[PDB]
Ligand binder design. Structure first.
Ligand SMILES: [K+]
Ligand SMILES: [Mg+2]
Ligand SMILES: [Mg+2]
Ligand SMILES: [Mg+2]
Ligand SMILES: [Mg+2]
Lengths: 134, 137, 91, 86, 208
RNA sequence: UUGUUAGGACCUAAACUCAAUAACGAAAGUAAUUCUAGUCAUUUAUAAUACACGACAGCUAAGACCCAAACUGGGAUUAGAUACCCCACUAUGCUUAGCCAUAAACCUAAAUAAUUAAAUUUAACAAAACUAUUUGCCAGAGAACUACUAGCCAUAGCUUAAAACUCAAAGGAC
């Protein structure tokens, strides 16, 4: 038994899913590893069909740090979906997929360059009938 | 000969003093971290108000009033008023489980106050009041 | 041939000999680079020596067995054997 | 309300590491289940749903523990091939 | 390409090959020994060991060339450098000893320092979000920053000049005027930076 | 109004962790603590026209009212939602006396005593299969949890329950 057993609306779902997943990742509720990653969430984008849910997490500088964060986050995404249905945030939640967002690195970059910038001064076949004949 | 996470026991004699103050005397920083607004109040150990702040009082409005950076600003503001009144060490009782639960404690550190302990007083009823009905979304 | 019913009598007859050599060297007990600038014969060349079709998994297993032979102490007979399956690399 | 204040749920800061104290306090409040309790207590969960969930959580744990046991029972047999070539 | 991917770009640095073996870093030393068993691409017709060959000036020539007329484009660049050298000699001779010291008469150094003065640190890429075209501040690479300086020069001279003036006379007057940080190309650079400061707040709307 | 109170009052309502437990009761149902009363022997299965019970929701009268809350009102939403969302508040959820007798009241498994071999997946999916005993129930589908009759503190209800009619399907698991 056990082995066999085992527009406006999208705005509301996208914002609330972001509002809730940020809370799940601020505590060890999902896992102690997920808590230590100190992951930040750029935004959540739910598809029109609701087949999947995109979670954009602010990527970092180190590829190794990002590769580890991706693996840990993905493994817990299935469990994270359980926590939102169990706390009654949303009755139905799509499979949560974790996507990278490297804009945060770009956002810091612009300010550094901009400050240094020089602005300048201001039927018949099937039947046996054929066969039986000969 | 090791540090103890457990706080000193009231009514006993301990060797731990901060700025020539015992644990029972250090002022208390009450952080109410809700899902919309993070309020902060600092009081003396005799329950006298010294500083007060919140995301709203800083000037944040509506949804921005309930972010991490908004509480951080509120904590720095509470520190400044308390630092003027003569406060260097605070006991942080953080009620609530909202977004600025940690950020408000981080703002108080940035503002020049020294946290010696972190307590939690989030209300947990033992059986209480029926919560509101689940939101259908 | 006693291995006729395996379907690859020549591939398995060769893997039988190389596995028996390995056992005697391991039971009985220097630099292994006796030959340099050489490569292991490609599957197409091996298939020609055996005269039977081999799969990619069969080729990989044969090479791993031949490598194990080189790791172990090798008398002059073993060096001549592994030489048969070493083809001079194009210079 | 009637108990003594500052004994319950109180961690002490070591050498001004205010973040380490907070991170430990969260691990405490989560290991004791207060975090899940506070989250779920935000909205009313009806008794029929509570039993269905707690039943699913129990069966899910049993399945993971047995699968973990099997993966660890064959952890030792995952070693270099002793009979390479045959 | 007719070159298989195994081919290596040629290295046409005369001193590098004649350096003493000990003066070469082991990384460089490794590449030389590796290259002995590899294939090398034939050198381009414009690639030589000449001591007067400047890659930046050679690139600027190709960006002025039209329809494969390299002789004409090289002639225009050669005439330009001469037009700048002759313009600085006149000023140098007609200046006091004190002024003469500052005056620079090397055209190659006026060209490089001019282009560098026209390079923009940040850029703006035009994007569409919410039914309107919203550009956003971007950080520019070393290649995009260099290309923009050359392209802006070759475009100011080609268009915004009198009908009877010639490119060696408009380009010389712009390299020198840019070399002093007062030309119109420098203004174009100021506008690009100035626009980015206005849109600094709205950098969020970037997906690439 | 808010935050704090190692201040006062109130004792309304509900019983965290334990509970990763599987106990009790005929079923419904029952888990804050203490005390009092209390479950028990009919060989066993087999009962209505009798007796006693029966979640939630609902009615009657007098109370209670922390919080929740059909509904109602105000605010948003949209090409427009009596929707979903926000705020306020009511019937109601509580108590003490009466009534209502309905749930996918389902472990969708009647209750008992067997056996694990009959060289038995005896459709398939569920929950291995099968035998004996006693009662209840079923006999293609829609018409029909309907009409009528009868009983009933119920009066749109509840239980009981057809025919004409029309078709060659309806239905179940994969
Ligand atoms: K309304
Ligand atoms: Mg009571
Ligand atoms: Mg008793
Ligand atoms: Mg009421
Ligand atoms: Mg009748």
């Amino acid at each position: 038994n056990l082995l066999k057993k085992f527009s406006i609306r999208l705005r509301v779902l996208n914002g609330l899913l972001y509002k809730s997943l940020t809370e799940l990742l601020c505590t060890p509720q999902v896992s102690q590893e997920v808590y230590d990653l100190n992951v930040e969430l750029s935004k959540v984008s739910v598809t029109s069909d609701f087949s999947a849910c995109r979670v954009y997490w602010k990527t970092g500088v180190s590829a190794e740090q990002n590769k580890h964060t991706e693996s840990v986050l993905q493994r817990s995404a299935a469990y994270m979906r359980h926590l939102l249905i169990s706390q009654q945030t949303l009755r139905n939640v799509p499979p949560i997929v974790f996507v990278q967002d490297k804009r945060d690195l770009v956002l810091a970059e612009v300010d550094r360059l901009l400050a240094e910038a020089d602005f300048g001064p201001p039927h018949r076949d099937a039947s046996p009938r054929s066969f039986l004949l000969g | 000969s090791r540090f103890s996470l457990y706080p000193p026991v009231p009514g006993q004699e301990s060797s731990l003093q901060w700025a020539g103050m015992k644990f029972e005397d250090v002022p208390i920083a009450h952080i109410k971290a809700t899902y919309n607004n993070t309020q902060i109040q600092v009081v003396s150990a005799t329950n006298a108000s010294l500083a007060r702040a919140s995301c709203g009082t800083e000037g944040f409005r509506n949804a921005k009033k309930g972010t991490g950076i908004a509480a951080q600003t509120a904590g720095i503001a509470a520190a400044a008023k308390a630092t003027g009144k003569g406060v260097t060490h605070i006991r942080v009782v953080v009620k609530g489980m909202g977004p600025g639960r940690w950020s408000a404690i981080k703002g108080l550190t940035m503002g020049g106050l020294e946290v010696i302990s972190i307590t939690d007083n989030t209300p947990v009823p033992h059986x209480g009041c029926r919560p509101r009905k689940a939101r259908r979304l | 041939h006693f291995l006729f019913y395996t379907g690859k009598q020549s591939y398995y007859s060769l893997m039988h000999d190389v596995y028996g050599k390995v056992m005697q060297l391991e039971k009985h007990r220097a630099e292994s680079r006796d030959l340099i600038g050489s490569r292991w014969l490609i599957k197409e060349e091996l298939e020609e020596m055996l005269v039977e079709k081999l799969s990619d998994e069969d080729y990989a297993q044969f090479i791993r067995l031949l490598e194990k032979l080189l790791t172990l102490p090798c008398g002059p007979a073993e060096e001549e054997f592994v030489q048969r399956f070493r083809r001079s690399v194009t210079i | 309300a009637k108990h003594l204040k500052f004994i319950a749920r109180t961690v002490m800061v070591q050498e001004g590491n205010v973040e380490g104290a907070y991170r430990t306090l969260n691990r405490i409040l989560t290991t004791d289940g207060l975090t899940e309790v506070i989250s779920r207590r935000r909205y009313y969960e009806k008794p029929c749903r509570r039993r269905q969930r707690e039943s699913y959580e129990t069966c899910r744990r049993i399945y993971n523990m047995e699968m973990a046991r099997k993966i660890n029972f064959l952890m030792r047999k995952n070693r270099a091939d002793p009979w390479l070539g045959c | 390409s007719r070159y298989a991917p195994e081919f290596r770009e040629p290295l046409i640095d005369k001193e590098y090959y004649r350096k003493p073996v000990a003066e070469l870093t082991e990384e460089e030393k490794y590449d030389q020994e590796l290259k002995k068993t590899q294939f090398i691409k034939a050198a381009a017709a414009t690639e030589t060991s000449s001591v007067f060959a400047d890659p930046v000036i050679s690139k600027f020539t190709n960006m002025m060339m039209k329809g494969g007329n390299k002789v004409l484009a090289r002639s225009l660049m050669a005439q330009t450098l001469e037009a700048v050298k002759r313009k600085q000699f006149e000023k140098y001779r007609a200046a006091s000893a004190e002024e003469q010291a500052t005056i620079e008469r090397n055209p190659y150094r006026i060209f490089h320092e001019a282009l560098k003065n026209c390079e923009p640190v940040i850029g703006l890429v035009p994007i569409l979000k919410g039914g309107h075209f919203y550009q956003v501040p971007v950080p520019l690479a070393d290649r995009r920053r260099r290309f923009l300086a050359m392209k802006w020069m070759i475009t100011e001279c080609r268009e915004n000049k009198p009908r009877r003036t010639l490119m060696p006379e408009k380009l010389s007057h712009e390299l020198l005027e840019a070399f002093h940080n007062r030309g119109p190309v420098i203004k174009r650079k100021h506008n690009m930076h100035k626009m980015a400061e206005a849109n600094r707040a709205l950098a969020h709307y970037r997906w690439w």
